[PDB]
Design a protein around this nucleic acid. Sequence first.
DNA 1: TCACAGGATGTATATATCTGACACGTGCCTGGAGACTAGGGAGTAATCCCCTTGGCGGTTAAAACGCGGGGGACAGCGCGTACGTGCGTTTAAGCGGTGCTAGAGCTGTCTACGACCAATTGAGGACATGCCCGGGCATGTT
DNA 2: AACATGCCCGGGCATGTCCTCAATTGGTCGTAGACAGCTCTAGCACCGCTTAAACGCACGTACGCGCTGTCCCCCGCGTTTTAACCGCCAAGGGGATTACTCCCTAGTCTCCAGGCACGTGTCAGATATATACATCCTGTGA
Lengths: 102, 108, 81, 81, 96, 96, 94, 94, 200, 200, 200, 200
Amino acid sequence: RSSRAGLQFPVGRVHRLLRKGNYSERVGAGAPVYLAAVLEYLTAEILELAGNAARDNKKTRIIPRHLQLAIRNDEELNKLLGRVTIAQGGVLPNIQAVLLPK
Amino acid sequence: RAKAKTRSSRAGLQFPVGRVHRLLRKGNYSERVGAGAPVYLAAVLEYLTAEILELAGNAARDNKKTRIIPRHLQLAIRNDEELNKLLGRVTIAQGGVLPNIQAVLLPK
Amino acid sequence: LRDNIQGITKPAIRRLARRGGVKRISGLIYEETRGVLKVFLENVIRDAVTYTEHAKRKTVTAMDVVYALKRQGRTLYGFGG
Amino acid sequence: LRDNIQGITKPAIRRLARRGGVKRISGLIYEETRGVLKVFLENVIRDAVTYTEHAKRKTVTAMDVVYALKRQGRTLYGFGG
Amino acid sequence: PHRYRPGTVALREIRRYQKSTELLIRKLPFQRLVREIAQDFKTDLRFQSSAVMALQEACEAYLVGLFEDTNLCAIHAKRVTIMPKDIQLARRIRGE
Amino acid sequence: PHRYRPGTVALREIRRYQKSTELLIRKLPFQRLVREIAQDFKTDLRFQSSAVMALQEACEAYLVGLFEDTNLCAIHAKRVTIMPKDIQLARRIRGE
Amino acid sequence: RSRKESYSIYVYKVLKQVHPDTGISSKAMGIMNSFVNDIFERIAGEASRLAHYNKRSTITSREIQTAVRLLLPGELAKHAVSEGTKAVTKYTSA
Amino acid sequence: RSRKESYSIYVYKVLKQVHPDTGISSKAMGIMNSFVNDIFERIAGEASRLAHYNKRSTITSREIQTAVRLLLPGELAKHAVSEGTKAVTKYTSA
Amino acid sequence: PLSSSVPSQKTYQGSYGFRLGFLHSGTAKSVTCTYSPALNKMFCQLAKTCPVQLWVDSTPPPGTRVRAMAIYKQSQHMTEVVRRCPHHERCSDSDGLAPPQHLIRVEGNLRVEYLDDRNTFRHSVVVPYEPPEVGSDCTTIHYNYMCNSSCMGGMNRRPILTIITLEDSSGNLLGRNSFEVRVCACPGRDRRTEEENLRK
Amino acid sequence: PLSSSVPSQKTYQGSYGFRLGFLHSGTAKSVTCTYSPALNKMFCQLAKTCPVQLWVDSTPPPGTRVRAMAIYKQSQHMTEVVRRCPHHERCSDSDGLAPPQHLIRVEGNLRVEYLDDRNTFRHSVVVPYEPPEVGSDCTTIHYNYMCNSSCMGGMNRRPILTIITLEDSSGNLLGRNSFEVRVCACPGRDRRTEEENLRK
Amino acid sequence: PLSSSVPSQKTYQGSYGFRLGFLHSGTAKSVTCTYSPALNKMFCQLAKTCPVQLWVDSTPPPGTRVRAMAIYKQSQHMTEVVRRCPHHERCSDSDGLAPPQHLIRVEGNLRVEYLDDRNTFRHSVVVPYEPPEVGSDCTTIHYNYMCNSSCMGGMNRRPILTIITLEDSSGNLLGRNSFEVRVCACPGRDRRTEEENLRK
Amino acid sequence: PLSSSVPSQKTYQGSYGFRLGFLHSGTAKSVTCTYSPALNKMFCQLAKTCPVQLWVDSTPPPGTRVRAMAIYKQSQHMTEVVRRCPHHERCSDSDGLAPPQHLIRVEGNLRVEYLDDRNTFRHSVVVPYEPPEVGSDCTTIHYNYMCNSSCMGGMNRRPILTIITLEDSSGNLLGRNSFEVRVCACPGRDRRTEEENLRK
DNA sequence: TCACAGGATGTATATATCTGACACGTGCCTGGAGACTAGGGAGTAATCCCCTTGGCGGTTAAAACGCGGGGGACAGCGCGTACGTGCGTTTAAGCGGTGCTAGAGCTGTCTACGACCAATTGAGGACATGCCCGGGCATGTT
DNA sequence: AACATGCCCGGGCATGTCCTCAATTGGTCGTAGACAGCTCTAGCACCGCTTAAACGCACGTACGCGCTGTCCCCCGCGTTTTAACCGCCAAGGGGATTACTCCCTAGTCTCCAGGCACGTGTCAGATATATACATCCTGTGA
């Protein structure tokens, strides 16, 4: 059970998905365990940054906008998700200096 | 016993149907593969193969050579607008490039 | 119907360009934008329809669009998938 | 080994740019080019070696380079694949 | 009276629309445009609202992303105004 | 005497180097650069000539393609010369 | 010997049926091999996803028929489709 | 009626670990489900090819580990690998 | 306590065409007694005058008597004896004729008799019958009810039926009728409420 | 404990056309007693009045008696004696007529008898049969059920059938009927729930 | 009947600093017991637990006792003995410790004593005093009131005062306090009503 | 029945610094025993293992004993003796050491003793104290609770406190602690509910 | 300052000499088709519910239309630096061997794990079943 | 008629149990992996010789950068008109769900010929060298 690996994500699900999707004939049982840990870890990284982003906007709740900002505020995730579009993400408040009045 | 006739021979194709059925039905792509599927695909590959070779052979004659060389394949692929999409990002060994010189660089 | 490309209206084009940080937009942009947007739509719809026809449905679903987008090198989150 | 980035000669950089249609040059290009080349080459190598380590080999083969390239949208013909 | 010497509003709009998430295109006309194109491939197609939402966000994302690059090209030409040829360049660089 | 005007050789070279198919970087230099980079990740790594050629042809292709886009950027700025900014712009437009 | 199937045989046969008085250099042949494998992988990949998306077990001429249209530009698609149709039509008829 | 699979439960639990006091909108939960399914597909897809190329009979933690290193930036990769390593280690001892 | 039996409540007009009638009193607040034909129910205040008319098609023999008895209307309570509650049983309100515990009294009649039945344990009040006076088709008996229907330890809010029997010298049955009784503080209010609930 | 036998539950109208009937109570959540014709089932509160009507096509002889007995409906539990649970068996709630451990009582009737059968170990309650009043069409008996169906150590949520037998003065079988019984705190809520599940 | 005397109601904290206290119960309609500081009045249901706290500045000797007694608040009625009404006096609700006629009981305590005073005819209930544990500030006694204020023939809607007295083992007066009591069905409703009248 | 006295519940760490501790159990389904520091309350299932830790700042002498006793938390119920309900008191689940009627048992210890106190009528279970095992800061006793809080005729939904006393070989107090106990089907569900209500 | 003709350089075509492409034959090794049986997929038909498509009215914002001034943009001009080009010298690369070791590649054998299937017990949510207080009605006093 | 005051059913909450799906545990058989050993090729290392490329220095023009003036595009604001957006209702079709039947496929078995791999020989291409065609640079013309 997940309580064996101490993970929150459900291994047996992942295991069944790996059996399908035509990825391979067969599986070594460590596989879904390892993969579950990774998916959980990445999930935490996003949510943690997103919660901080929600706090900056003084909200107790995460909304797609906050995921968008939180992702782009970490260039590692920005690269990983460098082709993704987020529903209701909005964009970054970047204005190029050459446009400003002086 | 009826004497064997190959599926390539039945379909009227040069490409090997049995091999293709093997490349589909094993090596992690599918749960099942039906007999018409390999035949269909072999024809498609054969058609596209012919198009490239036909274009390249013209390029070879435009270079007065009877033997096709990588350069000719490159020219064929980039002179045909559709191939230039299908293979748009492909890189070809010793391909070279097209003789494209921008008008603003020419002497005057 | 017809003439819905004129439905992509000029200030709406501007607002998109404001997200792109654009400070000033020339008179010829709007036509060019419409042409570009049409091509993008044509490619996505054509593929989406193809998925729908393959399933022999008459109704295009979010998944059909999401897939049509994906293979064009662009993944969309938040509509399923 | 060290400094073989200088091995990429200034005229070699000219020849490459010439094939790309380039006519006239600023010396700044040479140093910037080497930077860009290094990054590209390094990323390909890192993938190719990773494949090699996965196979538990000591030697990189063309197929490792082909895969390393391919996934970055760089299908390479002629070396196998 | 008072009236703005131009462009301070433009910067405010950039701020606002970059901050906000909602659709900037009109809610219904785009849906008709989808029908008008789709009918050319097949008649009597039927549209899930969610499907049309997905198309909108993809199109906005595509045009916005294109406008970012367009803007950079214009800055590179050291112009204030963007021009069709800026769009064309950014597309052609992106292998369209 | 003869003496070319500064900036005419190019048009010959352009055609020659567009026309011909051989590699434009010398073997030993490139080969050592590959090893010099790779050693940072793993000592005692060893190579196949096919692999080295494959790397080289991809690198030349990458740079050649980059230079063409770089050239267009420079033309778009109506310059004769390419500059690092042109490289950077083209790459940034391709999201690199 | 250890075995590696290659398409070189069929590639040249196709050339002979197009430009009989020509031949292929080993390197051009290598390229055509990668080309075949590349197009093969794509079509096989896309046909796989169609079946997955539709939650159904068998790859048939249709999945390929659809994959072909998705991968190829229209002009090539229609010709290819026509050929694929005839080959299967004949094969089942014969 | 019909029933559905999603990660919303686990996403919700993870959010509590990083921010016990913070809630999440259904829309954001929609995003997270796409994110999980996307990353899952990439890793599984890459690990599939590693197995295919090496003609091995199975996906193991190794293929996943390698795939993770090929898909993630280095920094994320280090941490991801550490967690995967512990998970397999603990699971083996448990 | 409980009785060994239940008195019959069936209407029986008999040889003499016996029946009951009641005054056309209104439903005003201050009303002491009022009757509802729709409910067949009397509403009256404690210890106040309650006129009940006796009607007959022909005059009964001399020595005929009229008896009144109370039973609970709900069938599970029918075997319990109706009696006054402990408060009203102890209070000093006896008229010198009625026992302290009897619920029903007859006023204005010296010939009244009160029975606590040795076999059934039922309480009842009896008077002689007399034929109608000049100018009336009926004979009127004035009852008093000496506990409210709500009295705790007594009726305890359970509805009661007053059974009236026309009887001969031995106590054999000549005729029988019955009506529901509520003894309450506001007869006019309560009558109107129950008649309104007849449409609900 | 376990009985040596199972009482027959088979309906038998006999020579007198014996049948049961029940009042048209509503489905109010906490109604005291309510019956479902669709389920042939009574829903009632613990110790509350449960009217059961007895219908006959002709009147049984004098000395006839009516007996009620409970059995478990599920075949596995049919051999167990239905009785009260250890708690309600110790509680001081006997009415001076019923034994502590009996599940079913009859209220109001001074002539009731309770049998603990020496051969079968079964519990049952009996009263004399009485015919309807003239102008009535059936006789009503008022049962009380002295444990909720849910009582642990007793019925323990197992459904019961009440079997009603018409009997002569000796206990010989003149007629038999049965109905399912649920004893519960909120009869109307439970009754509606079971009648809705009949469509599922 | 009438007493020969009226108990003193005067507050007297005495040598031990005796005071009363009460829980901060709200005014939910049917709250079992609630207290008003503004009226110095308790509102409670019949037979329900009425916690009264005992507060002292120093611990009384062992053998000390606490007594509770009731008197009418209106001076016209102060000489009448507060007792249960005739109904609740006869009903079988004695807990095995309290006499039938006493208005005030103490629950839970096995060492309770009930006094019917031979000289004054006043009823009272007594228990031994118990000190709190060293970090708790007061001892709680749980009284029960066995008639509603509205009981006819008893309190008959007349308000009462409860008088609490601390005593030594001989019954000598060590301290005294009092509070008004209303025993009623809806203590929260009634408390709000009387506190609202404090603004009228 | 009632008791002549109430055990003191005050926290008293005494000479040895006596304190209680409990395992960090979750709030999932089927959890046998889970403790809430926020409520100072233990939630557990009938007859399951309930680990209670004993903490001390210095070791008590050999012959020290540990006693557990249950009292009702509400002050008016404190004088009632906590015991098993009639059903569980009769059922055949005695382990050969515990009397049938005791609510609390200790498992795994042959030196357990069960007391039905002659003077107070209180039940309690006692074991010898033992110092922690090498490397442990505390000693663990495994209790079992042999009725649900909801058992009718037993605790009947009333909360209880378990009082733990450290005492010498004569039973004199050395230290004391207490915690509230709920015995129920779903300790995790119930603990979460009561902890969630703490924010409402 | 801008474009064409002749000569020079780069790219394409022919002859002489040498290598590779190509063509033909024999033995070995599955690979392939022909053949048969059974779980399953797929196909076809029937039924019900929700969504899509279509229609009508009111209100607000969007958009359309018009005018004036600012700035951008474009065009033109001038000066300096860097790049480009030519010639000469030096080093490395490329070319062409010469030699040795490790790794890769391949084959064989045995053990453990995975996969697959069944049975048993727990996780999770839904439901089964009872008590309090509140709402509201029932019933009395001023 | 308004306020005084008691009692029963309902909403909700309190608290015990059921049904469905997942996880855990055990067994059996086969394949792949793991581990070990052996052979050959390729890689890696080392040395010598020749030519081209790169590097370094010198010389000139064009391009880049900077600056000024002129004209039209665009932005900003006000007013008027049109469709969007919003809200509500109805009917039909499609999609989804369930049951039943036939044919494609998969899996297992047998046999024969072709292809594949290696071996052998001749002709035409490849390269090197020499000549002709296409583009660029220098000189000439406008």
